Scaffold this active site. Structure first.
Site, short mmCIF file in Angstrom:
data_model
loop_
_atom_site.label_atom_id
_atom_site.label_comp_id
_atom_site.label_asym_id
_atom_site.label_seq_id
_atom_site.Cartn_x
_atom_site.Cartn_y
_atom_site.Cartn_z
N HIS A 1 -19.25 -21.55 -32.22
CA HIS A 1 -17.85 -21.44 -31.87
C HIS A 1 -17.42 -20.03 -32.23
O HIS A 1 -17.66 -19.59 -33.34
CB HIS A 1 -16.96 -22.44 -32.65
N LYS B 1 -24.16 -26.58 -27.55
CA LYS B 1 -22.72 -26.64 -27.56
C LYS B 1 -22.18 -25.26 -27.88
O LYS B 1 -22.47 -24.71 -28.93
CB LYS B 1 -22.18 -27.64 -28.62
#
Ligand SMILES: [Mg+2]
Ligand SMILES: [Mg+2]
EC number: 4.2.1.10
Lengths: 218, 218
Positions: free
Chosen positions: B119, B144
């Protein structure tokens, strides 16, 4: 910001006269799809269209068969009809099928209010960048491109081309979409990609679905 | 097809015990955000989570401060907690912050059920392709990636990277998004881009908005 374009498509005079304008209350940009009429009734039907929608801006669009429209015209007939309607009615914008009717584009050179349009229902062509470049360098009022994806990457290509040309030509207005179910994402991507004219219905998307999506994206 | 991931984030035991499972009826994939608990209560709270959600697949996620989470841990504490929860509870998937805690990734090498996560809340980094490549070559259960756009082109880049890596690695599952209001379009682009795990709430989007968008896109 985004401009919603709603079509009007009467098939005869009694129909055009009978149109309910309240249907268009949320819209300030009207596209008269004159190709839904026989060629010999277009000019007869014009007063009804221009009188009814006098409160809105009006696009004159003669969408011809090779571009997915409902009329079959030579490029000469095409430009002659456009110029007659223009001389009498002064539409705010005029759609011109740049590639299909290129042979008569020289007749349209002085118009500052053209929507140069291109529709490919078969594929997203390998020279799409060149099509964007040629259309954008003309600096028409709007560059309108609709192409059929044959893969997910085709949809992204349409989106990336629009963004690159918009960034290089920020004053240029674009109306670009990737068609079909596959390309439907592109119809809600106008703010990201730089496509500000949104053609809706009252792949294709209704005003109601548009509003609902604009809601979520803001 | 698309998989909806809904978070569970109790801050203590009485809360975890008190959770209403009927809230998750439309969802078969649950993400336990264990970082909402003090480090010394995570293992105590696990039985309640695993017992309550026994009908669903469960992701164990210890989202740490540098990745936007609510707990501050050394990479050693991080892997130790993950391994203890794993040894006792056998979560279906385990989130591992690949870049932040790379120093202890060797301890996780044998796991076939990792969600390798990254992230970036500051920007869409210039070496994003390299990050995709390194993560994808490991062939974890899920790659992800969530990145913050600083322009419209950043949002498109995230989308195009996902599509390229998906096409080259069609068996690889991805969960990729461009964050913020700017990146919100990417959250509805999973079918086009090849991102099949969708993290929702009950930029961020709720299950209700998701459903409504999936409706229009089909
Ligand atoms: Mg005039
Ligand atoms: Mg085990």
């Amino acid at each position: 910001a985004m401009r919603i374009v709603a079509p009007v498509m009467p098939r005869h005079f009694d129909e055009a006269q009978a149109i309910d304008i309240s249907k268009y209350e949320d819209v300030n940009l009207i596209e008269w799809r004159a190709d839904f009429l026989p060629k010999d009734e277009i000019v007869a039907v014009a007063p009804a269209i221009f009188e009814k929608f006098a409160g809105k801006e009006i696009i004159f669009t003669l969408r011809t068969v090779q571009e997915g429209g409902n009329i079959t015209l030579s490029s000469q007939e095409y430009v002659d009809i456009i110029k007659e309607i223009n001389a009498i009615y002064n539409p705010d914008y005029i759609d011109f099928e740049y590639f299909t009717h290129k042979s008569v584009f020289q007749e349209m050179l002085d118009f500052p209010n053209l929507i140069l349009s291109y529709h490919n229902f078969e594929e997203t062509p390998e020279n799409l960048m060149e099509a964007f470049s040629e259309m954008t360098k003309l600096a028409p009022r709007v560059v309108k491109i609709a192409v059929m994806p044959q893969s997910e990457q085709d949809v992204l290509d349409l989106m990336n081309y629009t963004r690159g040309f918009k960034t290089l030509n920020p004053e240029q207005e674009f109306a670009t979409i990737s068609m079909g179910k596959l390309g439907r994402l592109s119809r809600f991507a106008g703010d990201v990609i730089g496509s500000s004219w949104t053609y809706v219905s009252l792949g294709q998307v209704t005003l109601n679905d548009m509003k609902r999506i604009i809601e979520v994206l803001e």
